[PDB]
Structures are given as C-alpha cells and as structure tokens.
Design an enzyme around this catalytic site. Structure first.
Site, PDB file in Angstrom:
ATOM      1  N   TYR B  71     -10.607 -34.637 -28.807  1.00 38.02           N
ATOM      2  CA  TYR B  71     -10.357 -33.260 -28.406  1.00 38.02           C
ATOM      3  C   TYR B  71      -8.861 -32.987 -28.293  1.00 38.02           C
ATOM      4  CZ  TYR B  71     -12.465 -28.935 -26.733  1.00 38.02           C
ATOM      5  OH  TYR B  71     -12.940 -27.651 -26.643  1.00 38.02           O
ATOM      6  N   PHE B 123      -4.737  -7.068 -47.167  1.00 40.56           N
ATOM      7  CA  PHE B 123      -6.049  -7.679 -47.302  1.00 40.56           C
ATOM      8  C   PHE B 123      -6.897  -7.219 -46.110  1.00 40.56           C
ATOM      9  CE2 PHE B 123      -9.060 -11.183 -46.540  1.00 40.56           C
ATOM     10  CZ  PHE B 123      -9.729 -11.160 -47.748  1.00 40.56           C
ATOM     11  N   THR B 124      -8.200  -7.073 -46.327  1.00 43.76           N
ATOM     12  CA  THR B 124      -9.086  -6.453 -45.342  1.00 43.76           C
ATOM     13  C   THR B 124      -8.980  -7.067 -43.942  1.00 43.76           C
ATOM     14  OG1 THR B 124     -10.670  -5.778 -47.034  1.00 43.76           O
ATOM     15  CG2 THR B 124     -11.494  -5.938 -44.773  1.00 43.76           C
ATOM     16  N   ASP B 214       1.926 -13.685 -44.932  1.00 41.88           N
ATOM     17  CA  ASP B 214       0.525 -13.966 -45.224  1.00 41.88           C
ATOM     18  C   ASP B 214       0.537 -14.866 -46.456  1.00 41.88           C
ATOM     19  OD1 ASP B 214      -2.126 -14.061 -45.962  1.00 41.88           O
ATOM     20  OD2 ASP B 214      -2.465 -11.892 -45.784  1.00 41.88           O
ATOM     21  N   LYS B 257      -7.361 -21.663 -49.578  1.00 41.17           N
ATOM     22  CA  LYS B 257      -6.753 -21.254 -50.859  1.00 41.17           C
ATOM     23  C   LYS B 257      -5.880 -22.387 -51.292  1.00 41.17           C
ATOM     24  CE  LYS B 257      -8.582 -17.124 -49.759  1.00 41.17           C
ATOM     25  NZ  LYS B 257      -7.672 -16.018 -49.426  1.00 41.17           N
ATOM     26  N   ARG B 381     -15.769  -5.754 -57.535  1.00 38.66           N
ATOM     27  CA  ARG B 381     -14.705  -5.235 -56.681  1.00 38.66           C
ATOM     28  C   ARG B 381     -14.425  -3.812 -57.149  1.00 38.66           C
ATOM     29  NH1 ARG B 381     -14.195  -7.809 -51.884  1.00 38.66           N
ATOM     30  NH2 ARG B 381     -16.345  -7.101 -52.259  1.00 38.66           N
ATOM     31  N   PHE B 448     -22.218  -4.139 -50.240  1.00 38.47           N
ATOM     32  CA  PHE B 448     -22.029  -5.047 -51.373  1.00 38.47           C
ATOM     33  C   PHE B 448     -22.747  -6.376 -51.136  1.00 38.47           C
ATOM     34  CE2 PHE B 448     -18.506  -5.940 -48.508  1.00 38.47           C
ATOM     35  CZ  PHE B 448     -18.552  -7.321 -48.420  1.00 38.47           C
TER      36      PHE B 448
HETATM   37  O1  34D Z   1     -13.844 -28.375 -19.957  1.00 38.94           O
HETATM   38  C1  34D Z   1     -13.616 -28.371 -21.193  1.00 38.94           C
HETATM   39  O2  34D Z   1     -13.929 -29.359 -21.911  1.00 38.94           O
HETATM   40  C2  34D Z   1     -12.963 -27.162 -21.815  1.00 38.94           C
HETATM   41  C3  34D Z   1     -12.672 -27.154 -23.167  1.00 38.94           C
HETATM   42  C4  34D Z   1     -12.071 -26.042 -23.733  1.00 38.94           C
HETATM   43  O3  34D Z   1     -11.771 -26.038 -25.102  1.00 38.94           O
HETATM   44  C5  34D Z   1     -11.759 -24.941 -22.956  1.00 38.94           C
HETATM   45  C6  34D Z   1     -12.054 -24.952 -21.601  1.00 38.94           C
HETATM   46  O4  34D Z   1     -11.740 -23.836 -20.811  1.00 38.94           O
HETATM   47  C7  34D Z   1     -12.655 -26.061 -21.032  1.00 38.94           C
HETATM   48  O1  34D Z   2     -13.313 -12.451 -51.575  1.00 43.90           O
HETATM   49  C1  34D Z   2     -13.015 -11.336 -51.069  1.00 43.90           C
HETATM   50  O2  34D Z   2     -12.501 -10.421 -51.765  1.00 43.90           O
HETATM   51  C2  34D Z   2     -13.278 -11.096 -49.605  1.00 43.90           C
HETATM   52  C3  34D Z   2     -13.044  -9.842 -49.062  1.00 43.90           C
HETATM   53  C4  34D Z   2     -13.292  -9.624 -47.715  1.00 43.90           C
HETATM   54  O3  34D Z   2     -13.061  -8.362 -47.147  1.00 43.90           O
HETATM   55  C5  34D Z   2     -13.768 -10.658 -46.921  1.00 43.90           C
HETATM   56  C6  34D Z   2     -13.999 -11.910 -47.470  1.00 43.90           C
HETATM   57  O4  34D Z   2     -14.478 -12.952 -46.655  1.00 43.90           O
HETATM   58  C7  34D Z   2     -13.753 -12.135 -48.815  1.00 43.90           C
END
Ligand code: 34D
Ligand code: 34D
Ligand code: K
Ligand code: K
Lengths: 458, 457
Positions: B71, B123-124, B214, B257, B381, B448
């Site tokens: 972890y 991008f969306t 991005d 990607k 598209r 779609f």
């Molecule tokens: O107690 C845990 O293992 C714990 C783990 C997390 O990723 C967040 C959190 O608030 C607690």
């Molecule tokens: O491959 C795409 O164009 C694509 C477009 C989106 O709005 C979301 C996604 O997860 C993939």
C-alpha cells in the site's frame, strides 16, 4: 477445526530480504519511526492493510494472460458482469478502478443537497463523497459498536430504533439513502446479521427509502452469518451472499478486499434510470462503462476471484487465521478490540503503554517497536492519523488509539501469525520500556503519510 | 526508410476467430449496425481506439510478475517515480488509474470558479473537469487546425495572438492555466512544435500564467518534432521529450496511450504546495499517493513502457505504420482528414457517401460496412456521437462526419493495414451501394454507446 490448514497450496512465493535487527533499526530510523515511510523491500510481513495485497490463484493468473483489452465488448467485462449478476443478484453493474470510484458515482447520483445519509458507522472515502455531494452523515449503528472491549455478536448491526427516530425527526424524503456496511471497519471489522438487513429493508420499504451496501468485506460477513446466526449453519456462503444483497437496492464494492485481487471495484444497482445515469457519469471519472478504469485482465481476475471467495473452506480459513492471531494475543493479556473481526486485529496502544500519554504517540511508537522487533509492518490508526484541528491548531485526540494488524488474504501462514504474536507479547511483557515519540518533521496535511519522529528522552 | 519493418519480434499472439462474411453480417445486425455494440470476440482487427489496447513487451510482462502490491513504499512506485522524473523532468508525480483521473485532480486544484482555461482544442473528459470546477474553456488553436483538408505542419500549434488577446481582455489573474495538448486529437492527431511551446511559455511567464500539458501522445509529438521541425533532426526522442516538458509547470498523462500499457496514468507538477494538495486529494478519488488507483504491477509496466517509448525505431515505426494506412487510402482517392496524425486515420464519411444526407448517418453506416467487409472495427465520430440537441430536439450537426481508424501500438502489421485499406478501397469503388441508416432504438444519453439502427429502404 478451530484452526484449519490452508485449503490450497503455494504456487509461487514472493522472496523477502530477511534483514537483521540492527538493519531494521537503521531502516526504521531512516523512516522517522513512521511505518508508512518504510520501503516495502525492507518489510518481512506487511500488515499495513488487507486492501489490494491479496495473493491471486493460478486460475486468476491464467485469466491475467487472457486479457481482452478492447475498449468495448471485452470478454472480460461480460465475465465480470455475469458473475456479479449471478452471485450478488443485482440487475446492473458498472466496473470502477476500486471501491472509492464506485462511491463517487453513487453519492453523485443519489444525494440531493441538504439530505441525510445514515449508516452503521463510516469509512473515510465513503463519507467524504456523501458529504461532498451535500449530505449530513448520521451514525445509526447499535451502541455496543462503540464499546471496544465488549464481546458481542453482530456488533455492526444498525439500531432500528435510531433509524426509526431519524425518519420521524427528518422525514423520509430528506433521507438520501441508508448506507449499510458489511463488515463494519471502524468497530474492528464487525459483522451484520441477516436479521438486521431484513429489518432495515422492511422499515425502509415502508417509507420508500433506498438502501445501498458498502460491501467490501461481504464474504467475511457471510462467514460470520454462517458461523454465528441461528438457522444459517447449513446454508452455503454463496446462498448467504445472494440473500444479503437481496435486501439492497445496490452496492459499492472493493474487489481489493473480498474479491481476492490487487485492484478493482464496481457499482451495482437494480434501478434502470440510475444505471443509465451512472453510465454517462462513469465516462468522465473512470472510463467507458465497458471497462470502468480497469484493464481487461483485471476485470477477469476480479470475476474469478469473487467466485473463488465463495468457497467455504477458503473464507473459513481466512477468518480463522485472523482469529488465531487475536486469540493468541488475548491469551497473553494483550489489550485488543473485541471480538476479533474478519480482516484485522486492533491493538489498543493506549492500554498497551499505560506509562505514556497519547501526546507521546503510543500507537505510532508501538508500531515502530513491532517492526524493529520482527520485521512486521502495522498501521498507526490513532492521534497521528487523526491529524490536527484546523481552528485550534492542536491535535485531534481520537478515542481509538490503535495499531492495526491487517491481514492480506492468502499471503501469510500461521507461522507468520506466530512471529507477529510472539514479538508483540515480548514487547508487552516489557511494555514500560517503550518510549514516547515526538515530531521532528510534520507535514501540513496527510501527516501520517510522511511525518517523521524521534524518541522523547528525560 | 519510408516504411520500416517492425523493430521487434512477436513474443506471443492474441487469438481471434476468423469468422466468414455471412457470420459478420449476422453479428453486425445483432449489434444494430453499431460497431460499439460488437463483441470483441467477433472483431478481427479492432481499430476502435489506441487507448489501453497496446501490446506490451516481454520486459513489461517480466515486470508484471514483479508486482510489489504494498500500500506504501512499493518498489514499483519508486521505479515509476524516478523514470518520470528522469524522462519528463518534473519534480513531483502522483499516479492515477488513467488520464482523466489526473485531470480530475489538476482541475480541482488549479481552477477557481469564474476563471478561464485556454487550450489548443480540447478532449471531452479534460474539458468536463475544467468546466465542472467553474472554468470557461477558450479555444486558442491556430485557425488552420479547423481546416480538415489543409496539409500543413504542426497544425496543433497555439495561436500566440489569440493568447495575447485573451490575456488582454480577461486579465492574467482570471486565467487558471493554459492547457497545451500534445498531440491534438480533434484535429486528427496533429503535433505541436518546440518553437510553439517556447513562445507560449515566454508569454505566460511574462504574466505569471501556469501551463499544464495534456501529454497523452507526447512521444508521437516528439517524433514529429524530430522528423519535421528544423534543427531537431539529430536530437534524440528522449531529449526532445525532456525539453518539451521543460516549458510546462506540470502535466496530465495517460499511460494507456504513449506509455505502451493497458491501464495507468499520472499527474506531474513542479510546485511543492500543489503537490501537497494533490497528495491529500488523490486519496478520496484514486487511492493513496503511493499507488494512485493502480496495482503495483501496473506502475511497473508503465515505468518500463515509457522508457521503451523513447526508442527511436519504435516510435518511428509506430507513426509510419499509421502513415502507411493513410497514404494507401490517399493513393486510391479515398477522402481522409489531412495531414495524417500520429495515432489514427479519419475517413471523411460525408464525401465517402455523397448520396447520403447526414440524417442517414453515413459515418455510422460506413463503419458498419467496413466491419462486414473485413472484420475491422472502427469508431463513428460524427452526428451520432455528437448527440441530440437538448433544447430543440434535433441532432447536433458536427462539421466533421468521420470514421476513425485508431491504431493500437505494436498490435497489428502492415498486412493488417493492407487488409483494412483494401476493404475500404473496395467499398469506395462501390460507395453508391452503402445504404443509409435510421434508429430503431435511441438512448436518451451516450447514444453512440448503445443505439441500434437498421437500413432505410
Ligand atoms: O485505513 C486505511 O487503510 C485507509 C486507506 C486509505 O487509502 C484511505 C483511508 O482514509 C484509510
Ligand atoms: O475514444 C474516444 O474518442 C473517447 C471519447 C470519449 O469522450 C471518452 C472515451 O473514453 C473515449
Ligand atoms: K495493490
Ligand atoms: K485496456
């Protein structure tokens, strides 16, 4: 059997370095006596958490070689979907990368601002998403859950009277949903009875209130029902699990817990309209509904793992291994949360170190000592994790000052449990020699993650 | 070479069912002539997307056996961390389960309500999170990027004048950040020059404005710089990538990607205070900052993959394989978006099917016909993906009515590209026979994804 042998063989091992005490002390000091700063490579037995640390099976790894990584229509998605539909009984599933992804979706869809969410205690991420979306959280767990020393069955049950009181005082239409967690983490991993789930369902049905399970350790919960709820002794784990969820409108699941995987989760629901809304929401946070932020191979491993978890001998051994550790500690007089839960043993560090004050961080120091003594890593869940009060600038001072011994599934043996217990018992017999800690570096937030300490000397 | 051989061998193969035409037609009809509804088991060559569909190496799979699933303090986390620090140059990294996870974090941290985010198209998911946090998106890409037929270099570049204008009218304080995408998806996968990144940095520095990349196809972008930007011919891909990010304050990355993995992403930044805030925030959406919603084995695979992506012969072949497809289509007169981008070829379905109105869904029907002819899946598209106009109840009518042929990395061969091209070319020679589609089932959202159609008669 009180303590059965592992209902499986070891297929492959994870080698460990086995460093000597002098070297462990050096690494602990380099980590500022904070076990969160230890490198995994320096830890022999890692009981930091049972989340995502599980050992997969040969069958799961075979599945890992058959990842269908297609963006839509993956065979692995269909396997996961049909598996969850069969075993949990819900109409619809949306995969998520893990549990808190599903929580984000559920709370974003099911909560109007100003509403209430009531549950049997809470988990940090779950409650965050509820509150982030405008809800006030109400604890409706039975009072016994807050007594760490009280050994009673199904400590995680909701108090129906508190739920009735809430409905009368706030009105049904102002309650977003009931969040029923199985098992209950904050109480030490305590189960909920089928009888309780039925009673909550009946009362909520009267008022048109929805119930959503926080289901991360539902198989551990099913085992406690099978073992301890009158009438269920000859009912299969699979049939108990299916019936449990029959009293819910949906659930958030962490595969990282009882689905025996290292990553993965999902959101289930019966309602068609909510499913449609979840589908368009999941796209922007997790990924398309056809993979939900998971590789194909991980949908496959989670599908296989969930079915593996249903095997009686597996979950019996899982829970009895944890029990073994707790009972061995209890026998030596070590103070622990009782009864022992499904996934972890909690040491009461406050009572383990009566010579220290909480402001000397007994949980943090005890965790450090355990590692130096054995190579075992445990998690501080006390004053350090509680963080600082933003207004006063003083420590939060939580009632629970604990060290959590959290057991991954199928990773360790009874001999490892013995090593842990023996080290802790040795420390306990000389508890007065455990020194307090003080900060030498404190981050302004998430302080448990990177804080560093050194010992107090007089 | 114009078209080099694969700079690797096949280690293992993925089984496909070689189903005949009559069966493909049956499956397509069962899918409502919507390729998004096809089962993967019924697809031979799947060009739906280049996201998370890549073939990993033997080295990556070796890493997959060495998953340190702790972890905190995972060896895999430290590998990823120092790999990204070395290759991208950023001070801090936060893993995320994929790109849009990183976008959620960045936009939550860097945007005050009422501010603006300006970028080279969008991008969306990226734009969603920007707007969700109260930003207004401003397009500042060069005008040329909106001319789908125009063949010019570095079509993805930001128009500095548009940025200068935005700063003057809105004021620097009201701009949350510049979002510079590499490559630019909406223009067909078009690159951005180093010169452009510099000018943007220079202007933004003058006004104290942050720039975040991005960077999902930054290695494809680096290849275009090496190949086509004057002076970079003899600069390594690795060095080009490092200099690209030297002009940024951080980035959101999708490993799915250009890091050659099936899942994974991360957020990078240089600012300590932002990093500390990110570490707090990532816990409730993705996971602890030491794994960020990824298994240890996937942090490992992504670390290895990013380093593999720096190999010149690899990214050269990647981009030239896509180019091969595009050029083969062009040589037969098939209409496509130009110039060919780094990761995909876009068919112009409007000109492919001039006998069809946009209301008959030519991109959707073309995608169906391609599958029936070859077993190749492509993505609509166009008008279907555009959705229905909420207010007036009519279709949204996008200028681009296209079928996207998206190429996963290291999965297919030139022979597969030939099969794809030969099938499309055969359809093109008999294009009049492509029938229009109509709804038989239409969802109220994400249409779609699950819409079903049949032919008009
Ligand atoms: O107690 C845990 O293992 C714990 C783990 C997390 O990723 C967040 C959190 O608030 C607690
Ligand atoms: O491959 C795409 O164009 C694509 C477009 C989106 O709005 C979301 C996604 O997860 C993939
Ligand atoms: K893990
Ligand atoms: K994938």
């Amino acid at each position: 059997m009180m303590y059965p042998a592992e209902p499986y063989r070891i297929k492959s091992v994870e080698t460990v370095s086995m460093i000597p005490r002098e070297e462990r002390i050096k690494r602990m000091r380099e980590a500022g006596y904070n076990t969160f700063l230890l490198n995994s490579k320096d830890v022999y037995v890692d009981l930091l958490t049972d989340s995502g640390t599980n050992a997969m099976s040969d069958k799961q790894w075979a599945g890992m070689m058959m990842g269908d990584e297609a963006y839509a229509g993956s065979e692995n998605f269909f396997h996961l979907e049909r598996t969850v539909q069969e075993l949990f009984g819900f109409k619809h599933i949306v995969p998520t990368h893990q549990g808190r992804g599903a929580e984000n979706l559920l709370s974003s869809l099911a909560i109007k601002p100003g509403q209430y969410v009531a549950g049997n205690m809470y988990f940090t991420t779950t409650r965050y998403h509820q509150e982030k979306n405008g809800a006030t959280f109400i604890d409706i767990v039975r009072d016994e859950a807050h007594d760490a020393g009280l050994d009673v069955k199904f400590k995680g049950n909701i108090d129906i009277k508190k739920l009735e009181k809430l409905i009368a005082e706030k009105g049904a239409e102002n309650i977003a949903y009931i969040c029923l967690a199985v098992t209950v983490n904050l109480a030490g991993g305590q189960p909920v009875s089928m009888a309780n789930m039925r009673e909550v369902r009946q009362l909520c049905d009267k008022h048109g209130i929805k119930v959503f399970y926080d289901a991360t350790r539902c198989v551990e919960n099913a085992y406690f029902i099978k073992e301890q709820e009158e009438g269920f002794e000859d009912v299969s784990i699979k049939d108990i699990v299916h019936e449990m969820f029959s009293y819910a409108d949906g659930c958030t699941m962490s595969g990282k817990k009882d689905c025996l995987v290292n990553i993965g989760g999902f959101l289930c629901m019966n309602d068609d309209d909510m499913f449609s809304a979840a589908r368009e929401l999941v796209v922007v946070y997790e990924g398309m509904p056809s993979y939900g932020g998971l590789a194909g191979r991980d949908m496959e491993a989670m599908a296989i793992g969930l079915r593996e978890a249903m095997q009686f001998e597996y979950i019996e051994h899982r829970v009895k291994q944890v029990r073994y550790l707790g009972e061995k500690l209890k026998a030596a007089g070590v103070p622990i949360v009782e009864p022992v839960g499904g996934h972890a043993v909690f040491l009461d560090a406050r009572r383990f170190c009566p010579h220290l004050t909480q402001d000397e961080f007994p949980a943090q120091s005890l965790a450090a000592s355990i590692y130096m003594e054995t190579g075992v890593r445990s998690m501080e869940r006390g004053i350090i994790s509680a963080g600082r009060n933003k207004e006063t600038g003083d420590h939060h001072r939580p009632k629970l000052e604990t060290v959590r011994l959290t057991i991954p599934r199928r990773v360790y043996t009874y001999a490892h449990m013995d090593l842990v217990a023996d080290g802790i018992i040795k420390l306990f017999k000389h508890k007065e020699d455990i020194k307090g800690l003080k900060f030498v570096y404190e981050p302004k937030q998430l302080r448990f993650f990177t804080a560093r300490f050194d010992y107090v000397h007089h």
